[PDB]
Structure 1
Amino acid sequence: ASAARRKEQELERSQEQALREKIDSVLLPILGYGNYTAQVDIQMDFSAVEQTRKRFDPNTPATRSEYALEDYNGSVRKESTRNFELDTTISHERKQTGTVARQTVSVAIKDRPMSESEINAIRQVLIGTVGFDQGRGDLLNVLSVKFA
């Protein structure tokens, strides 16, 4: 199984490399060659979830058989027996093993600095270039630093 773990590491590294390639394909025309640096971290879960759900519909029952005895005298006896049929959904789901659980991307732009408007524009391009998903916990940093 350790060979499987090794190949999982290979998958994660391949994903990171592909994302880096896309980042380059976007930023190389916009910024130029050597005016930026970017690295990508991709964390992938490899669990084996397998779920079975059996759901009913309480608010729409359908009476199948029914008995109702109601006699008076004073005495009032109200017996009743009822059998129901209910909407039944049975869903069996099997999640894919390797899923990107969190994605971190950081891009540093060489100074000569960059204005806030262009930094936010680059961030907007990257959002969509990488597939930024904040609800997944992903993080995207864009900074303007001084290259040596």
Structure 2
Amino acid sequence: PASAARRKEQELERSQEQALREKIDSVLLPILGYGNYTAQVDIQMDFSAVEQTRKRFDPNTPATRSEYALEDYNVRKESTRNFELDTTISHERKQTGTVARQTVSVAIKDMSESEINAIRQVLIGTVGFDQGRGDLLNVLSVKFAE
């Protein structure tokens, strides 16, 4: 029944996180080294279904088709005009599974501020940090344990 329509979304969300983690590991491994960093990510998405239909008009450019006028003097002023305007019709079907938010957190074993800024700048391209969706990207250094 419907028990399979949600678990598929659950596995898809997990697969996205796994791919993002794999992409993250490829960049930080040769620069920081093995076992000198930890990172985890998560993605939240929605599976709604939206259909849109739009019909627009242009009132600034009217075109006349039939026109009748009467200008009786002595004072009758009668006018009857027909107009035809531009018509635009649009039909749109949205996607299902758009990414809503994305959070990335990176911890580096103990670094000055310049190196942290450089690492953040490098990771920005690798991740796709975008402010429109309210994504969060944090990178920081702490002392590990032995």
TM-score (norm 1): 0.90
Alpha-carbon distance in structure 1 between the residues aligned to 2:85 and 2:142: 64
Mark the runs of 5 or more structure 2 residues left unpaired by the alignment. none
Cα 1:8–1:71 change in 2 (3 A) is: same
Give a deviation string over 1:74-103, Cα, whole Å, max 9, x none: xx3322222222222111111110111111
SS at match of 1:135: coil
Over the residues paired in the alignment, what is the CA RMSD in angstroms?
1.3
SS at match of 1:117: helix
- Work out the CA distance in 2 between the residues paired with 1:60 and 1:94: 30
Per the normalisation by structure 2, the TM-score is 0.92
The residue that corresponds to 1:134 in the other structure is 131
> 2:20 aligns to what SS in structure 1?
helix
**1:117 Cα deviation after fit:** 1.3
Q: SS at the partner of 1:144?
A: strand
Structure 1 segments unaligned to the other structure (5+ residues): none
Task: Tell me how far 1:24 sits from its aligned partner.
Answer: 0.5
Displaced runs of 4 or more, over 4 A: none
Query: How many pairs does the alignment contain?
Result: 144
State the identity as a percent.
Answer: 100
CA offset at residue 12 of structure 1? 0.6
